[PDB]
Scaffold this active site. Structure first.
Site, PDB file in Angstrom:
ATOM      1  N   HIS A  47       7.353  12.148  -4.092  1.00 31.55           N
ATOM      2  CA  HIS A  47       7.997  10.878  -3.795  1.00 31.55           C
ATOM      3  C   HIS A  47       7.030   9.720  -4.012  1.00 31.55           C
ATOM      4  O   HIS A  47       7.420   8.645  -4.468  1.00 31.55           O
ATOM      5  CB  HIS A  47       8.511  10.876  -2.355  1.00 31.55           C
ATOM      6  CG  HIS A  47       9.096   9.570  -1.923  1.00 31.55           C
ATOM      7  ND1 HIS A  47      10.415   9.237  -2.145  1.00 31.55           N
ATOM      8  CD2 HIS A  47       8.544   8.515  -1.281  1.00 31.55           C
ATOM      9  CE1 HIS A  47      10.649   8.031  -1.662  1.00 31.55           C
ATOM     10  NE2 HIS A  47       9.529   7.570  -1.132  1.00 31.55           N
ATOM     11  N   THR A  75       0.822  -1.207   0.000  1.00 30.38           N
ATOM     12  CA  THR A  75       0.000   0.000   0.000  1.00 30.38           C
ATOM     13  C   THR A  75       0.858   1.260   0.000  1.00 30.38           C
ATOM     14  O   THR A  75       1.850   1.342   0.725  1.00 30.38           O
ATOM     15  CB  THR A  75      -0.963   0.044   1.212  1.00 30.38           C
ATOM     16  OG1 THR A  75      -1.914  -1.022   1.114  1.00 30.38           O
ATOM     17  CG2 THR A  75      -1.712   1.366   1.258  1.00 30.38           C
TER      18      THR A  75
END
Lengths: 152, 152, 152, 152, 152, 152, 152, 152, 152, 152
Positions: free
Chosen positions: E86, E78
């Site tokens: 990022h 996840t």
């Protein structure tokens, strides 16, 4: 493979102009005559039939196509928007007539009836900004006369 | 079930294009070749008739289907909104002609006349983000002619 | 008081479906081809004719009525608004050839061509909120068929 | 001038369809599997490979091209925007493996995966307003196939 | 036709989960068991590899498919939007790895990495109103491995 | 700990689908009739019962459970908001007879009737964004079936 | 597969109509005849019971199905929003009665009670742009009774 | 001068009514009776033909007046605006048919088809505020019948 | 074929009125008695049972239907909106009870409990603008008594 | 049952028209002729009485019908709103007179006096959009005449 000649020296045209809105149809006719005339068509191989107005132009156009005397028929006239929807049915039946009764006679019948909103739009297209619809109708009649009349 | 082939190996197609809006109809006739051709139709079995504009496309489209030389007749052209309702009576009669006079010939007459509001829309439908409506009207022409078997 | 039956135990029905917008015409055909079946009309006594799109539905629908093999012919198709008036001339001519034009044959021709504004509207009559207009156009076919006076 | 044919009389085509969004990919496959058939490609010479969804279409599409049994492979699928960027990485990798990645085989691989924003947009290309992108991706397959230069 | 079974009676699956966001990936690995298990896969034929986070899932997912011990490799994890871009480079490379490096192994590597914007969305897709994306990625894993028959 | 299996190798399933909104219930049935098949349930061991619409699904669903021929019965249908509260009484009674009413038989009866607000919402669960609720209602059927305690 | 006929050649139907809103239910009972009749049902095999209003339609609809004289019982009536919530408890119990007490009889009891907000909406569904909900409830009645074969 | 009689004692009239919008066309047919009756015409010496939609009127209106059975034929029906332009193509062709094909026969065919925007406008002209446009089209029928007179 | 007599000279009715809101139920009862009385019913063949309020009316109504002494039972009472949802459950269970426990007894039990929002709405319907709900309940009991009690 | 005949062949009618607003009442009297005429009444077998104002109508309408000369008397006139309430007392007493003093005679006296707000509303009802309220009051006169019938 099948383009239409644009020189009509030996052609024989006949036109039907509507008297209503003479102020416009006049210069509209002179442009068509001037066109045929300066494109070769003999100045006397050309006939003009004055009808009451555009609604009447389908009947007499048929009477000149069925007369088997012309190489093409040019329909000239002018209709301008009024207050009623009358303008719509007139404009429609003229084109509806000229187009439909151009196949019933397999004879080039050029539709050159102005259908405008403003008096300024008619003038616009009677030898003004847009050019002369009449003259453009003759140059169209000559072409159709090479591709549709003596061609089969 | 009665589907229609899409391979026109041995078909004879005749096309009728209007000069008005050549800027569009030109690259729209690019549906003829690179369309009929790539689907099998022979380079030579394709004839093209140039008419003044859409209004004159019913008459000449008739004298091509009645010549019995073509299995199907493709009709091409372009019309764009003006300031007058003239655009309406034209589009109507073109479609009214190609349709109502495709039942009197029993020969498939595909209606491929662009009737748009913008020059941009005509371009959208002549080889841009909508594809070429001339190429599509050919695919339809082949299938139609190729579907006339429960005929005669 | 001459009314029409609704059970079609021994009926001969023919269907002409337009391929364009197959996403709708598909379920639209299944409506008729399942309304006929369940109304007692033979699953093996129904012919379907796929045409490019609606504009071609008058021609092929004619060669099925003139085929003299069907008691009634159902015309299925779908046409949805675009950006141009192209949509109007199509809808018109479809619901004009199909429409009363086909009185000439004296074979019942049911007009079941969806003419909508939204993909969501067509999907409403394709077997959703408003029901399947193909099923309804089949019920109309059976009824029309069971109406017998003949001209002679 | 090396162009591509469009009749696929003797063609061997393979199709990989993603099950996810079957509601669209369904009609989307029927587009190709009916464009191929009617283009002269055998109804019995077409293989279909159902994968979970688009992300798996590169892998199985590879084992069909590497299978060396098809002249071209068609990839059908549908991906629609969600609430997360998950949609982006999927679309990317599908149109990346399928996309030019599969140059390694030198077997034509047509990318026919719908990547839209709305369920209504996908339904537009699934055989509605914009046409069936499955049919178009089959026409591309036949053409690509009929392009023969071989590296050696 | 080449569909894929959904019964994984005798399959060997290997799973690779990222610790980052364990709160989600934990109940997301609940797709492994109560997923693979309930579909037939043996309790013992399932191995699980814990990696630091999604970025490290391509490497270890490789050293599990290349071990040739598993019929398919399920990849779980996840990632959620931060303040920096990022998040983008991570999600990209995870998907870029699992995909582009699933063709170099010929072994089905199902991509089951949540890439969301909210903790709430991750929850929505870990056993809430969207279901568990770990259970779905297992069903896909079985079918994929079970579909590799026109392989080798 | 009594849980339910998920492979249905030897299962006897019966399905009752409402014809109304066939556009949705169609794909909705294909979801179950393809989830069952691929889950190992026989393609030849599934019966489908077409009822007018959802309101009739409790009655016919009863005569299938009471038929004592199926391990579980799946109820498929679709109901969409109208202008009247008619929608409420329908949905209610469907998810009321089907719903727990059918405890009397002690045969598993899965409620898989779509009850939405938009044609676009039903189309979301008919095999799009939210997945196919027919497939999910079949997985529930297999699981429920594989739960055996019997009253006596 | 278990579809249901739509030809009611030899059926015996019983109808129960509520007097309240006779203005609507009257032309709504016009679905009985010109509905059942046109589908085959015999003029004489149709009985009609007039009740005070919808609330009294469960009781008398029961003493008609239990008489075992009818293959199916059609229930007709109309209810329109007032100022009080009285409208709710009525519509509920009518639907609650016709449904919940159609399983205790095993005899198809079609629910054809209009539950609307406007007099205009009731009219919309009694023979106007939504069609006649009495005629539709008859078609359903025939199919239902004609579908009770895996019964007894 | 050629006025038309209004007392139609010895007249045979034929009526063609559309079933769609029966709620309106019903009372509209009330123009036949209590209309032709009080003007002299003999009680049920008048025939009524029920056709599915207003669209089917032209066909059957023909096969009645087509061969001498009546001195004049009346066409009754109703058409109300929908969301689609379907309303237009129907209205048009009905009026188009009844009018255009009332000259070919030469037997008086009175056009009495309501073309409204509201259900309230249909009621407005079906026996409300504006009177009954069915009773008015009957008066017209008698007068037109008594005008088959020719000229001197 | 099955209408209900409205003269109840030989009838024998019994009513249950709720004391709560006596201000309304009083005039509500007097209207029901006045109705039965002036419709033929003997002034002493009529019994009245006073219950605490509407919630209690299902229990004692069942005790008067099962007493097998009456030809019909009339339930009278009044419930008006409060600040809490208490009003809803009361109103519901009253109708829910009276309707459901009118089939369990196959005895005409007329539901005549006012369920309003305003004290002015109750008065409105207790022998004011709307008429007297009680009187209207008696005229309903008599009819049901001819169609449902001594009829079987 | 006692309907009123509409063919008034052997009738004597008397008309009383108001001179004021002659511009309207003129065409309004056009309801007498081209009204009673076409319904059978003999040409000028009808008497017309011109009175100053609509106010004087009642008096002379009496001294015509007062002693048998006609089977029915028609009153025509027009009254349009002014600045004063004078308009009201006139309209009232006209209607009051013609009505009240149509019972004392017992000879049918039809009230046909226009009572409008606009001159455009008078024209609206004098042969425009709403028709001619004079021709309508003539039809009424004939029907009422044929209702001097008494009862059995």
């Amino acid at each position: 493979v099948f383009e239409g000649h644009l020189v009509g020296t030996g052609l024989k045209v006949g036109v039907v102009v509507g008297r209503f809105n003479e102020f416009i149809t006049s210069k509209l006719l002179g442009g068509a005559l001037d066109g045929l005339k300066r494109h070769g068509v003999e100045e006397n191989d050309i006939d003009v039939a004055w009808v009451p107005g555009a609604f009447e132009i389908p009947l007499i156009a048929k009477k000149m196509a069925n007369s088997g005397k012309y190489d093409a028929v040019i329909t000239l006239g002018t209709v301008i928007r009024g207050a009623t929807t009358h303008y719509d049915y007139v404009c429609n039946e003229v084109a509806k007539g000229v187009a439909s009764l151009s196949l019933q006679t397999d004879i080039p019948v050029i539709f050159g009836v102005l259908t405008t909103e403003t008096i300024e739009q008619a003038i616009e297209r009677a030898g003004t900004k847009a050019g002369n619809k009449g003259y453009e109708s003759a140059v169209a009649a000559i072409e159709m006369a090479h591709l549709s009349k003596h061609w089969a």
